[PDB]
A paper describes a structure:
Focal Adhesion Kinase (FAK) is a non-receptor tyrosine kinase that regulates signals involved in cell proliferation, migration and survival. FAK activation is initiated by breaking an intramolecular autoinhibitory interaction between the N-terminal FERM (4.1, ezrin, radixin, moesin homology) and kinase domains. All compounds exhibit a common 5-chloro-2-ortho-methoxyanilino-4-anilinopyrimidine core structure, which binds in a nearly identical manner to the hinge region of the FAK kinase.
In contrast, AZW592, which has a sulfamoyl group at the corresponding position, makes no significant interactions with the activation loop, but several water molecules fill the space between the compound and the activation loop. The activation loop in the AZW592 bound FAK kinase follows a non-helical path similar to the one observed in autoinhibited FAK. This allows the gatekeeper residue Met499 to rotate its sidechain towards AZW592 and it makes van der Waals contact with the chlorine atom on the pyrimidine ring. The morpholine (TAE226), methylpiperazine (TAF089), dipiperidine (TAF672) or methylaminopyrrolidine (AZW592) moieties in para position to the amine groups of the aniline rings make almost no protein contacts, consistent with their incorporation for improved pharmacokinetic properties of the respective compounds. Additionally, an analog of TAE226 that fails to induce the helical DFG conformation displays a 3-fold lower potency. We evaluated the potencies of the FAK inhibitors by determining dose-response kinase inhibition curves and deriving IC50 values. As apparent from Table 2, TAE226 and TAF089 exhibit approximately 3-fold higher potencies than AZW592.
Author numbering: 413 to 569, 584 to 686
The structure:
């Protein structure tokens, strides 16, 4: 059982970014016999108290519950100071950069695959009654060309243009508001890592959305798919599909794309 890893099994590599609690490094988990595996190591800033430590480690506690091919995998924790969380490394990095950089080398079928894969992770999370609250390409990682994984999972310490009307207006976050965000995430993927509502102010966004305005159909996005996206953006959350539906729809759209 035990998620506690001995610190000498970890070789800290280069800083690859920042979480809310501190720096994230790439690195290696070493074990006897045993090829050696690339890991992400999340660190914590100024946690000179239990409370900050407890908040930071909650991410690990949350990820203990999940076992999915398209969700970042927790490997372990080191709970004596400095406290670290060890995760699997998604070696190709952040989705947006990957999409931007590989625009002329990715076919439409790959973009749909990523959407389908993310929807299986989200249908999984739905069944655990886990509300993610920030589904956006910034939180998707690339493990390989044919594999993406969803991250955080962790706590703080507002993503207006990704959020459902009911999340913005009534601080409501549910499975249906996550579906809305997934729709925007799919727009980002089809758009190759372009941000929704560029040059638009956050306080403008709810005005436009309640006036019925929606993100336009991406060039070379199939109609059946933009049709699925628009259903994610139904104002009335009770009419949006659930991730179980989306997973089955994205499957047929993907398969019809690989069939020409
Ligand atoms: C932009 N500068 C960096 C240079 C290379 N970068 C990355 C980013 C992610 C990355 N892969 C990760 N794989 C797993 C995990 Cl948990 C991970 N975590 C993060 C890396 C960087 C910043 C934040 C995280 S995070 O706190 O776990 N949250 C992410 C979902 C954004 N990265 C890379 O693998 C080599 C390289 C970006």
């Amino acid at each position: 059982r035990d998620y506690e890893i001995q610190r000498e099994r970890i070789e800290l590599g280069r800083c690859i970014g920042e979480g809310q609690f501190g720096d994230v490094h790439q690195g290696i988990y070493m074990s006897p016999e045993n090829p050696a595996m690339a890991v992400a190591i999340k660190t914590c800033k100024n946690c000179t108290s239990d409370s900050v430590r407890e908040k930071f480690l909650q991410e690990a506690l949350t990820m203990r519950q999940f076992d999915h091919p398209h969700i970042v995998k927790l490997i372990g924790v080191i709970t004596e100071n400095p406290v670290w969380i060890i995760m699997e490394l998604c070696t190709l990095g952040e989705l947006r950069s990957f999409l931007q950089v590989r625009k002329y080398s990715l076919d439409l079928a790959s973009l749909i695959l990523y959407a389908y894969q993310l929807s299986t992770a989200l249908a999984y999370l739905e069944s655990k009654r886990f509300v993610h609250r920030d589904i956006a390409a910034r939180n998707v990682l690339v493990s390989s060309n044919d594999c993406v994984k969803l991250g955080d999972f962790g706590l703080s310490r507002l993503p207006i243009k990704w959020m459902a009307p009911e999340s913005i207006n009534f601080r409501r976050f549910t499975s249906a508001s996550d579906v809305w965000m997934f729709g925007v995430c799919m727009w980002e993927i089809l758009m190759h890592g372009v941000k929704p509502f560029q040059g638009v102010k956050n306080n403008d966004v709810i005005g436009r959305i309640e006036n019925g305005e929606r993100l336009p159909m991406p060039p070379n996005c199939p109609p059946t798919l933009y049709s699925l996206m628009t259903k994610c953006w139904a104002y009335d959350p009770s009419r949006r599909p659930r991730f179980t539906e989306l997973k089955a729809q994205l499957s047929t759209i993907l398969e019809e794309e690989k069939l020409q």
